[PDB]
Ligand binder design. Structure first.
Ligand SMILES: NC(=O)C1=CN([C@@H]2O[C@H](COP(=O)(O)OP(=O)(O)OC[C@H]3O[C@@H](n4cnc5c(N)ncnc54)[C@H](OP(=O)(O)O)[C@@H]3O)[C@@H](O)[C@H]2O)C=CC1
Ligand SMILES: NC(=O)C1=CN([C@@H]2O[C@H](COP(=O)(O)OP(=O)(O)OC[C@H]3O[C@@H](n4cnc5c(N)ncnc54)[C@H](OP(=O)(O)O)[C@@H]3O)[C@@H](O)[C@H]2O)C=CC1
Lengths: 316, 316
């Protein structure tokens, strides 16, 4: 069997380490090594890709399966000469639970005025800040897939009122849900918006001034909050800045940005009640991805269906 | 029936407001009002107390029941002339769920390096910080009462490994528990210590250097973390400062202090990876306290047992 082509432009040291023992039955070709840049890899069957080279499918034109290095596949969709073959994304219990850690933490920090507590602490000021309890606040989760459903369940346990939005209607016990055409209804009920959407043409430039002005205004936190850990190109950052400055948004938590790393001169870094994390909301341990690809290759090759295959028509 | 004596030294404006409609069948005497302070209230049956006047029981010597304004009663225990009558503490679903919000938030902020993320954000630095998932970390909850059991359940849902310590043995499904004599076993397994103990003579000056040096050292967060939302006099703050500076503790979250408000010259304010909240972890609305006292008076007066009565021998 030919080696697995690996073009993963994150944590190159971690990738190099794991590849020493990964795909033991065939080996790998790591495009992080500049010497592999011009290699003849025309017989490659499997490629593992994160922000891959734009010409990758010219250079590997006989692929059987494409594996994403993440849960998102927007870096692969739209590539030139993308073959009509399965694209398998990364879905993993550890990834999922880490995203829910981040979501719940951010929701609690907004509920409990972490920003204000930290500001007072820095000034050595003792100031009790009256917080509503979680049940007085509605968290609206946009995206009810692997990540969204886990976050919904854990937010509910913490005591938040939770509602959900997704493309097609969902049934989730104890959680009012809304489909694509019911976006405005959902927004009107939401105090804390949590974004867990994939990036598609339908979700690009989606979180804008008009949407922020539809969020609930007379809620227990006073002003609504925007949280996004999906994709940065789903939001309009200039609109986030203006909304926070104006009081349309009371605050935000952002793990993802229109261009990453977030530019040093962005106003977002020092906005009051805004939390920034550097696209690290759900970083699953380096080996879990590779064990996952190995498993799917094994299933594929012995006649079991591939799992976590994206819907090409839907684009995720 | 004589009016209820109220000496609650928190949120005096909120107390005055709620008292306008509380105890509708008998009224109240609020010692916040100077005109009440030297009145003859010798026939008082019920007193509601939070940081009360030291001479209160000389001035109200015929009490039938004492109600604490909080879940803790250490402010009442040890008062001069404390009568041999039931002391009823505040137990309330809103209080409980708010404490669990705080506990879970603090545990997540330590798990996910909130302090480090915030420090970088303030410097406009994009810097991924590798976090373990919750299941790689053991949270040891000290105190398995109303607050402890709620926190244990929610921490487990978030994915932490959770163990518990209490005076007498508990049975909690999926949670290894330890009794008084097993303290050292419990400490050795604990990466994040969560304090939800009452203040008694047995728990005074309890969280000290010796105890911090028994916490687990080779865990996924690197160094162990001390979280306390019980009582400030249970900790030795000089030892917390030295432990954090020396790397015995990786960080801390403290809602309670030996002397409150925390002095402006405390070294705690500026210690790296230390979060300070001003004894506001679980602040239930005043209405809930007053509805609670009304309920217990009603039960008492129609022959039903008082609930939430402290054990004088145990001291809580
Ligand atoms: N910040 C980080 O570290 C990470 C970010 N992510 C991001 O999270 C995203 C979500 O992951 P995951 O939950 O596994 O994906 P899923 O495919 O499992 O779920 C996606 C959800 O989004 C909904 N959705 C998609 N398009 C639309 C639309 N046009 N209108 C309304 N709803 C829509 C889907 O609706 P329906 O159910 O009807 O199909 C589905 O509920 C990833 O695509 C990735 O970009 C992922 C991992 C880590
Ligand atoms: N920061 C804040 O805003 C707040 C702080 N608090 C504090 O939290 C404390 C706990 O409240 P709550 O859960 O309702 O109280 P409980 O009486 O319900 O539970 C107390 C727990 O502590 C255990 N305990 C007591 N003494 C010891 C000891 N010497 N060794 C080991 N375990 C011991 C008890 O053990 P066992 O089960 O064997 O009896 C019990 O599990 C309050 O007393 C108060 O000081 C409360 C409210 C808000």
């Amino acid at each position: 069997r030919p080696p697995v082509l690996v073009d993963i432009k994150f944590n190159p040291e971690g990738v190099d380490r794991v590849l020493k023992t990964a795909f033991a039955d065939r080996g790998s070709i790591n495009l992080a090594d500049p010497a592999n840049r011009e290699r003849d890899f025309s017989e490659t069957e499997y490629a593992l890709l994160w922000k891959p080279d734009a010409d990758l499918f010219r250079r590997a034109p006989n692929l059987k399966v494409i594996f994403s290095g993440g849960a998102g596949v927007d870096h692969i969709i739209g590539m030139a000469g993308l073959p009509d073959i399965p694209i398998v994304r990364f879905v993993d219990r550890s990834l999922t639970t880490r995203m829910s850690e981040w979501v719940v933490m951010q929701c609690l920090m907004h509920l409990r005025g972490q920003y204000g507590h930290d500001s007072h602490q820095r000034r050595r000021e003792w100031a009790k800040l009256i917080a509503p309890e979680a049940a007085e606040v509605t968290v609206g989760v946009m995206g009810l897939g692997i990540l969204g459903q886990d976050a919904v369940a854990k937010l509910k346990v913490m005591g938040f009122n939770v509602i959900g939005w997704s493309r097609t209607r969902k049934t989730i016990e104890g959680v009012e849900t809304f489909d694509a055409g019911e976006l405005d209804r959902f927004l009107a009920k939401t105090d804390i918006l949590v974004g867990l959407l994939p990036l598609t043409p339908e979700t690009t430039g989606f979180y804008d001034s008009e949407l922020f002005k539809k969020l609930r205004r007379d809620g227990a936190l006073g002003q609504p909050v925007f949280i996004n850990a999906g994709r940065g190109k789903s939001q309009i950052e200039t609109d986030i800045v203006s909304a926070v400055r104006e009081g349309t948004l009371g605050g935000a938590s952002l793990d993802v940005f229109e261009v990453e790393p977030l530019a040093t001169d962005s106003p977002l870094w020092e906005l009051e009640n805004v939390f920034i994390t550097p696209h690290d909301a759900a970083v699953s341990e380096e080996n879990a991805l590779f064990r996952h690809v190995e498993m799917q290759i094994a299933r594929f090759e012995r006649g079991e269906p591939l799992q976590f295959v994206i819907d090409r028509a839907a684009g995720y």
